[PDB]
Write a protein that binds this ligand. Sequence first.
Ligand code: JDP
Ligand code: JDP
Lengths: 539, 541
Amino acid sequence: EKLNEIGYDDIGGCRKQLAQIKEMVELPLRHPQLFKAIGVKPPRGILLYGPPGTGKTLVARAVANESGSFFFLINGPEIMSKLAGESESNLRKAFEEAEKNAPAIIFIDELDAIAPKREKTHGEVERRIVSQLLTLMDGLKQRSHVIVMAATNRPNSVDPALRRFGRFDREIEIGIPDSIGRLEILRIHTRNIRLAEDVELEKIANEAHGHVGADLASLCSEAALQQIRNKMNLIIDAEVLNSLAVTMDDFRWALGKSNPSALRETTVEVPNVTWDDIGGLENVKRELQELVQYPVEHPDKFLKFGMTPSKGVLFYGPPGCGKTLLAKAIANECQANFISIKGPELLTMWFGANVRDIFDKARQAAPCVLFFDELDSIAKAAADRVINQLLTEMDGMSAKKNVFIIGATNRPDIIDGAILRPGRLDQLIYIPLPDEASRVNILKANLRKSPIARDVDINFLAKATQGFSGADLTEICQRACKQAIRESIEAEIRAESEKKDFDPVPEITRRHFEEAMRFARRSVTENDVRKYEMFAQTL
Amino acid sequence: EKLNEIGYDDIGGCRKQLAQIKEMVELPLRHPQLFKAIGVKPPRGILLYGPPGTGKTLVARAVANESGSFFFLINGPEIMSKLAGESESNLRKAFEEAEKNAPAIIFIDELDAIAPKREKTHGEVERRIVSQLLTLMDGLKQRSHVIVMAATNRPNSVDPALRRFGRFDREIEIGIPDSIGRLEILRIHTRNIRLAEDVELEKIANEAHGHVGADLASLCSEAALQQIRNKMNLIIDAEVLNSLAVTMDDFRWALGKSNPSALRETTVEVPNVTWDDIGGLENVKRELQELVQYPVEHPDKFLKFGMTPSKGVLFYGPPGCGKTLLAKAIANECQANFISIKGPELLTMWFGANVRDIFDKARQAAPCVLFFDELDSIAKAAADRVINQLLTEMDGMSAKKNVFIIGATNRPDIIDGAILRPGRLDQLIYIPLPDEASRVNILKANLRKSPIARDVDINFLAKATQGFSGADLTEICQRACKQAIRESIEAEIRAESEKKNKDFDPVPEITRRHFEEAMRFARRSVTENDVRKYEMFAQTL
Ligand SMILES: Cc1cc2c(C(N)=O)cccc2n1-c1nc2c(c(NCc3ccccc3)n1)COCC2
Ligand SMILES: Cc1cc2c(C(N)=O)cccc2n1-c1nc2c(c(NCc3ccccc3)n1)COCC2
């Protein structure tokens, strides 16, 4: 009987959308007088879409329960699992009961099942039920106090006729939870499971990438199974039963063996790469501040001076110089959402229309940076369709919506000149090989989690490199760590053999870094650097 | 019960169409004696089409109510939601009840639902309804005084059989409202909502691009919701309730977060770019006047001299010289509609016939200037299909309908010579880099909204920038504005630091210094070689 007690606190990583739906639904159903007085018309149909398992199904019940409304549930499979007349009778009865017991919420859990695309019907009963649903949606009066909520995997799966301005006009996306949402879901799912004192659910939430709420429930279940195995493979005994608590190692094992279902779905989040970490690149700092931070933080100045900000940059520069991190940092300084799209991903999804989906999602998000990772794959100069999609979508993106498109290219001389036209992406910014401070910061980011020895002078390594790209520094650090692991394992084997300095190699010593450096080679030739300098004028 | 009172004043941005429909429907059904005497036959079927949310659904009721006729409504979803026999029984009862209570209007709301394309039926019950609808539409007796009206998203969706000369012969398009129509919509949706005295609804309309009437209802709803947020967050005191009025800052917030449904719908409007703003380019003014204005303003002299005007023009010149604006300006001087089509758009829509749709809309519009920007992406010399469609449409377009096709190209040498034949696009006009007079207006147009300091000599900059293209001038001003914003934001930060230690506006205008810095890095974007190449094209062809 927990259904009647499902509240907002019992739903996981949809805090922003939960607040939005609260404002949309609860307030009109709790204080109709205010909205009627001012004139606001509460929404008729709210469609929720997103990856499966997010928890969008519980949102309608939570809203109804905490607003005191009546809740009638319409399950698409249930209505489509009945005869030709009984399904229509059930739809009509649901709407009639909702009208009788207003204020009320009708929840169509699988709207895609009831009303798929008209091309997929291939029947008369299905089209009849679709038309009946349309009529009932039109039947509901503006002042009946019945709010029809719906859930679907993808909004494009619903018949377009249902998305008219009178039937389903508001669409809210319940996407993949962030780390805070993941922690909330894990806390919700562990209220009954007994947890050991050594579990840090924050770390588990931060590590689980691509995990939706159902995936986290599976994670907790598998962790409990692992604990039972550990305490049962050796051993029924009441004392042992009371000593059964999920330890952190069990959670780590479950996470390692967990195959999340939302790894392939794009993430929208505010990156935590503060510009204090990027270090130098201060010319790029100033340019990106002028191009992104000022339009978002101080719209008043732009309105005062009557300048429409340009919403398009191109990050051209040698490979492995942290263009993605620069985009993330400029997103963070503005507290702007960040969306990262790789060329292979776009081509693969096109092979499997979705160019407009990502821009629509960017519009959904608050002021955001839409970072395309390799634009030569799309703008080579099959791809002739994606290029035009992108160009037209940029040509239709109003400059006042605060969506900044930042495309990165290692090879800028191949990009089609159409993209670089004024008003599309005409803000060429050059990202050079990291300077001294940038190199120190790269080496410190690489060695953040690695215990280094005090004798190691990171500043000396940065000074010595003087030309290495970022990937080169990462390779140097990885070589040093590999040699350290090689020494640790050799010492462990020697200790085992001698059985017939508890930790002989606890930190990476200066010798490891020296040996790694001896074989280091520059990856960006001076000719390449000269070539990238001339592109600013060759265009 | 407001349905019985829906008039013409309660519908939004369809002022032109409503007047057209008023003559078509209200006048015959009000004075049948006059039309019968001369011999006019009032229309049988009027198919209203356009993007969703325009307000075409209320037109039938407004026409019926004002003319006193009987209004019987038919809903596509409703009829197709019933059994095989009841759906047909309702169609026949709708027309049977209409003839009984004539004069009357039958409004089919979703004609695409009842009568989709014959290839989409894939059933027997559905195909019986289509045929039943056809029979009823052909059973009207031209004296029954019953007028059928229909609404559809696109006319091509309807079964072609319904669009014969006896069933649905008149099609009226209710499209995206223009700025005046947006204000009509923004004033009918605000009759009940209380508004603050600081609200200038005219400004919101001119900024609401791509907003259909339904979308403008979301703006008002969102704007009022914003006011509740502001007052509720500060907070149900009755005094506060009476002080709840939508302020303009709320509207601007709503407009920023509003995602209009019709941003991708093409616009038909008369541009406001008067030729007095284009400045010079006077050798282009004479040629454009001889080809667009005189045929439209003075048809008499063309008939008197027996000359058929050439309906095609090609604009070729260096990039960023305001070719589009010149096309807009001549349209304004003729009060002609202007349709701008981009090369990328035509290919994108073709991948997703539509060439014939652009021309058909041009024909429906009053004397029109159909601009084809980037005609080098279509006439490159997939695309082979689009060029032929464009090539055939021009040939099949009678020169007497006052529709002019202007094609702008930055690279004319690539254009296929088929388009440049004497039949369709036979006139070439060269738009050069802006001259001294024009460069003054380009700078003025850019700095129209920007408060400039009196020490700035706009004339001096134009004299200095002899050779700069239009985009080069625009870049200079933006750099001036960009730098001006920087000195304003840094001054604010310095003020904050000084405030902690203890000229209201530090930089109120773009000083002469800001322009000086921008000009130093400014570089010409059209090489002297490129200018020479364009000159030789007139003879190379
Ligand atoms: C771990 C790592 C690899 C890498 C690479 C690379 N091709 O291996 C390139 C650029 C930055 C890189 N970082 C890196 N990663 C981070 C930071 C940071 N700071 C310096 C920097 C940043 C952007 C840009 C330049 C230099 N650098 C600071 O934020 C945390 C992560
Ligand atoms: C804002 C703007 C940008 C721009 C560009 C450009 N490459 O961005 C090219 C030509 C004119 C341009 N304008 C512009 N825009 C306007 C005007 C005007 N001056 C006269 C003119 C027109 C076309 C041509 C020459 C000179 N210039 C005057 O009418 C109002 C709008």
